[PDB]
């Protein structure tokens, strides 16, 4: 399946993607002893402005894995169709979860090459102090740079197609089509991250970004 | 034509050890054949090599995102390019054509200098061996060394001092990565 | 164990520059400045890989400006020319009436300007000729290849004539059929 064009997406879809990748929820050293719907983990009053936080997984084993662990969270947070747990406002999130104890000795800097229509642009940088880092966290961090510099989620920008590739030192590599949004709304867009896929930080080689114009 | 020339050379060197397990980046600025300043990934910052390079090293070391980019170029640049050209460089195999003939000179009668030429091959690692009647000779062996033709093929000539005798068969053996068992060319 | 080198230069007042990638001593590609295209040493390379010429053009512009800066910084110290060593040699051992290639290997010189001619008998030949760009060396001198394809004969002799500023007299290396 070839790279999806921006022109295919509803204004709402672009605004929702802009919103997700510009305002993620980022918190360190929190803990939940509460499973909901067998898959989700609940952090009471731990979200933005004291909201409740529902961290959603694809499987029950994933939730049981972090249940009652001191975790770090880094993911795309939404409200619409976030299921309430109490009468407090609830804020939702897929995956983005790793262990708080598992930190590097020194910050890992990962470089990203960037081309637009094959034209080499400035190299970009992201960081993490996590020994294990979610793929979600790094996708968010790249698309944030891309949003800032290239306006990838503005309807009227020249960027019309885009691809992000994570180049690993180990055999498996990962890829993201920036306009292959699984649907119009945050809860649909962000579901891609539910597997909680996590990379060893030392094994990441670098990132490649290819953006394309109408030309 | 008489005008004095002035030359500026730039080198970004990616040094690979054991596939891509260990990479080294050496970035070099060279004025009139004289290296002035470099970045070396084992050092992690710029360093002047002559006093002409001094202003550059310290201007360049003052930019944290420059340094950061450079120190991750070992990946974004070196491994990246290694991977890009792996199929047609690292794993390039061209099989040599082997030929044996008497040299067309030599001192000084009642003697024979034999020539083994291996041509049109890639890569440069190669073992060439001479045999007299199935027994290898190591004495009186002289070689050109590898010759790089440009064009991604090597050639080398190995010579042997012979004091020729009745019945003899000489053999030139070539062991090389493009072939799964040695190449032998026979001469009489 | 291997080495990939991205090598560039700018030369004044000649105002020429070059940009090339070197793998272990062989050229993968260079960029032709005049025609703004990427030229793969071997044609097969160029369906396996790509490189946008523009990136080299931007680099060469910075190299130009930097050379002017350095030239001035050194109180206009010019380069000392270093004469080349030439060796002529052939593609493969010469077989009478079977197409072969003559190789003029120009080594250990600087600056990178060199006038090269093939003389058949004594007259200049420029038919089917080809050459490489200035390849790099660890000592920061240059290497260069020139190519004359022919057909081997006793009825002919060859002279690769090489001119360079660090040579008080044009250099001549001869090759006759063996």
């Amino acid at each position: 399946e070839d790279l999806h064009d921006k022109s295919e997406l509803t204004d709402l879809a672009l605004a929702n993607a802009y919103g997700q990748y510009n305002h993620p929820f980022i918190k360190e050293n929190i803990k939940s002893d509460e499973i909901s719907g067998e898959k989700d983990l609940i952090f009471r009053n731990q979200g933005d402005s004291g909201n409740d936080l529902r961290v959603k997984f694809a499987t029950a084993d994933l939730a049981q894995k972090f249940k009652n662990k001191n975790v770090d969270i880094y993911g795309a947070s939404f409200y619409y169709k976030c299921e309430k747990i109490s009468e407090n406002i609830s804020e939702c999130l897929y995956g983005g979860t790793t262990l708080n104890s598992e930190k590097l000795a020194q910050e890992r800097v990962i470089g990203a090459n960037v081309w637009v229509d094959g034209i080499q642009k400035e190299t970009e940088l992201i960081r993490t102090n996590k020994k294990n880092v979610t793929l979600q966290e790094l996708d968010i961090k790249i698309r944030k740079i891309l949003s800032d510099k290239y306006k990838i989620y503005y309807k009227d920008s020249e960027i019309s197609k885009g691809l992000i590739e994570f180049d690993m030192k180990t055999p498996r590599d990962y890829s993201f089509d920036i306009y292959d949004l699984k649907g119009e709304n945050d809860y649909e867009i962000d579901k891609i991250y539910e597997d909680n896929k996590t990379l060893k930080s030392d094994d990441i080689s670098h990132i490649d970004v290819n953006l394309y114009t109408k030309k | 034509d008489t005008r004095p020339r002035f030359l500026w050379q730039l080198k970004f060197e990616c040094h690979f050890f054991n596939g891509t397990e260990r990479v080294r980046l050496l970035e070099r600025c060279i004025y009139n054949q004289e290296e002035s300043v470099r970045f070396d990934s084992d050092v992690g910052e710029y360093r002047a090599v002559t006093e002409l390079g001094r202003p550059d090293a310290e201007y360049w070391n003052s930019q944290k995102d420059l340094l950061e980019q450079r120190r991750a170029a070992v990946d974004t640049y070196c491994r990246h390019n290694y991977g890009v050209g792996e199929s047609f460089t690292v794993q390039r195999r061209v099989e040599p054509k082997v030929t044996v003939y008497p040299s067309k000179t030599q001192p000084l009668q009642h003697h024979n200098l034999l020539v083994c030429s291996v041509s049109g091959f890639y890569p440069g690692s190669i073992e060439v061996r001479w045999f007299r009647n199935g027994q290898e000779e190591k004495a009186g062996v002289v070689s050109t060394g590898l010759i790089q033709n440009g064009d991604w093929t090597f050639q080398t000539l190995v010579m042997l001092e012979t004091v020729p005798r009745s019945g003899e068969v000489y053999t030139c053996q070539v062991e090389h990565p493009s072939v799964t068992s040695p190449l032998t060319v026979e001469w009489r | 164990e291997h080495v990939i080198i991205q090598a560039e230069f700018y030369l004044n007042p000649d105002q020429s520059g070059e940009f090339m990638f070197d793998f272990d001593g062989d050229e993968i590609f260079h960029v032709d400045m005049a025609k703004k295209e990427t030229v793969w040493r071997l044609e097969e390379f160029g369906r396996f890989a790509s490189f946008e010429a523009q990136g080299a053009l931007a680099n060469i512009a910075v190299d130009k400006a930097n050379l002017e800066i350095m030239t001035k910084r050194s109180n206009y110290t010019p380069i000392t020319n270093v004469p080349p060593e030439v060796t002529v040699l052939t593609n493969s051992p010469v077989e009478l009436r079977e197409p072969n290639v003559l190789i003029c290997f120009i080594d250990k010189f600087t600056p990178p300007v060199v006038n090269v001619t093939w003389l058949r008998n004594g007259k200049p030949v420029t038919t089917g000729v080809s050459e490489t760009v200035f390849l790099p060396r660890e000592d920061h001198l240059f290497r260069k290849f020139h190519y004359l394809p022919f057909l081997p004969s006793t009825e002919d002799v060859y002279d690769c004539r090489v001119e360079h500023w660090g040579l008080d007299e044009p250099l001549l290396k001869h090759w006759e059929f063996d």
Binding site: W115 | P55, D56, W60 | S50, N59, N66, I69
Partner: peptide, 13 residues
Amino acid sequence: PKYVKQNTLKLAT
């Protein structure tokens, strides 16, 4: 795939 180039840098002025 693409060859990446390292950018040449402007010298100190």
